[PDB]
């Protein structure tokens, strides 16, 4: 499956200036567009190479949309202040996530249209794309508002139509980047702990997309240990990184194996240094 | 102005460390709220000039993440680290770069 997601953040800073507003567009796990009110002039700028193929009217319409949404979020911050009986001297945040995951075919798998106030869930469009789910009473006021006005219909119209079509277009244009599959380069490192045990470390570098599984099978299989495992992090060049470490007594190094399961690999890797 | 998530820091590099070969050092800071944060990259305890930052965005649970990166030429005697300041921590956390972790 593939995804087109948009992440929007409005943060207030009383005494300084107007609220800072940012928009970030993602295809799958790769950022490709950005908006920021704290720039030389606020415009929708490209962040990937394949997206620069778009014409000037593309960026013009996206900039207009971002500025409209920024005004909306300013008003929203003030009304949330009124809603929660909060002082005008504090810094508050308003996050918004909207997007579509479609299957390999093209049918819409899932639509997202959710908001959060101060890092807490506010209101979210359900899976039916018709009804809303609110957290507290202010969000219930917002929900009854949006149900009178019927905003769910317009939001579902975006999620089922515009979003899917533009995701198909983005995949088609950036074929060379988005749908590539890079195999992980993996290796095992060794460290002597201050005691008699040693730390074995299984790496996986330079893979794309980020979906990978790193596991440690012992003499046979199973985990059965507090294996260390960091989250998949980005190397900053389009590829990703992961590693899993384990402790092992001095001598059993030849009895431990690492398994790398990645979609860009014909056969999962079995490893041991 | 509500909850507090303490940032998580990872310092690493793209390509495996090779002495004399220039590379990119990354500071990956995830799972923090509020989004106001300060990240500095230090070489031998001194601040590195040109430090570039990925655009701030959040994850499914509304926790913000960000990626700082700079050019660096790793040697065997140079020390690299990442210092973070955030409203959830009493003091600026420093995570040193381990060429094996």
């Amino acid at each position: 499956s593939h995804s087109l997601r948009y992440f929007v953040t409005a943060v207030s800073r009383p005494g300084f200036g107007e609220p800072r507003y940012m928009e970030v567009g993602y295809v799958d796990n790769t950022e490709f567009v950005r908006f920021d009110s704290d720039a030389e002039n606020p415009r929708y700028e490209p962040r990937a190479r394949w997206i620069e193929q778009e014409g000037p009217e593309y960026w013009e319409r996206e900039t207009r949309r971002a500025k409209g949404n920024e005004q909306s979020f300013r008003v929203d911050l003030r009304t949330a202040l009124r809603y929660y009986n909060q002082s005008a001297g504090g810094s508050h945040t308003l996050q918004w996530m909207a997007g579509c995951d479609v299957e390999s075919d093209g049918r819409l798998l899932r639509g997202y249209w959710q908001f959060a106030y101060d890092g807490c869930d506010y209101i979210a469009l359900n899976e039916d794309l018709k009804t809303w789910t609110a957290a507290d009473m202010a969000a219930q006021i917002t929900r009854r508002k949006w149900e009178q006005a019927g905003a769910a219909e317009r939001d579902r119209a975006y999620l089922e139509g515009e979003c899917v079509e533009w995701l198909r277009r983005y995949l088609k244009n950036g074929n060379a980047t988005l749908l590539r599959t890079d195999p992980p380069k993996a290796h095992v490192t060794h460290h002597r702990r201050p005691e008699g045990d040693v730390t074995l470390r299984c790496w996986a570098l330079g893979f794309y997309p980020a979906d990978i599984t790193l596991t440690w099978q012992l003499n046979g299989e199973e985990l059965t240990q507090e294996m260390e495992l960091v989250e998949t992090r980005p190397a900053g060049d389009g590829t990703f990184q992961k590693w899993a470490s384990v402790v092992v007594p001095l001598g059993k190094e030849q009895k431990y194996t690492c398994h790398v399961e990645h979609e860009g690999l014909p056969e999962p890797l079995t490893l041991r240094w | 102005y509500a909850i507090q998530k303490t940032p998580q820091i990872q310092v690493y590099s793209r390509h495996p460390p090779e002495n004399g070969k220039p590379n990119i050092l990354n500071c990956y800071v995830t799972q923090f709220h509020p989004p106001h944060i300060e990240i500095q990259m230090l070489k031998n305890g001194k601040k590195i000039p040109k430090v570039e930052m990925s655009d701030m965005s959040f994850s499914k649970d509304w926790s913000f993440y960000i990626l700082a990166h700079t050019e660096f030429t790793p040697t065997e005697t140079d020390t690299y680290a990442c210092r973070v300041k955030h409203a959830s921590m009493a003091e600026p956390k420093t995570v040193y770069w381990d060429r094996d972790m």
Partner: antibody
Amino acid sequence: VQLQQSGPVLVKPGASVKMSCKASGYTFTDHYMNWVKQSPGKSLEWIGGINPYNGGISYNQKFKGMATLTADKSSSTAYMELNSLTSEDSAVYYCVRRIGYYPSYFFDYWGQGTTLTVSS
Amino acid sequence: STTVTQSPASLSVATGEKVTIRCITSTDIDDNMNWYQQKPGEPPKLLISEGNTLRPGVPSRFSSSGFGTDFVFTIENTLSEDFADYYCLQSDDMPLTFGAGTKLELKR
């Protein structure tokens, strides 16, 4: 908006004392709480701080072992406890609020201060 | 501890001229330097926060400058109510350290 400290205290040497600091006019957990000493002449030294959100504590090495910082979220009150008190501890003690949200450590609001006298 | 030296310890100026207070640090603190004013009897009041940010409500005659190790606090055309004690405080790393202060008195 308001930080009300306890009244002046007089204790004997080698004893302990607990000062309070009642906060009002803001969400208590959204700000750190520091304590600062001011001596007759040589003035203004940071003792330590606490986070009422998770109890996270920072201390000055000069006063490590002497100061115990706690905070109660229900009554939105900070407490500092001094022990093994000498004459060089007689001073004015302020609870000060640390700026919130931004990644900074300066203080913005100061309590009225409590005068502590250690004398036999 | 990073030491913080404030100069001068005392100053004598009339009503309406410039007051310049220097504050040096022992390490690099970037611009994380803050300026507090304290009138007799009262607790200190924050005047200028990190960087050179003038706090809300503070009159525009107060200003700060400097960066790294050297910092300056300037009052242009001091009023009669500007005469008090002034302290500088770095907020770069722990422990937070204050200056020795400046006893600014009215030269009448």
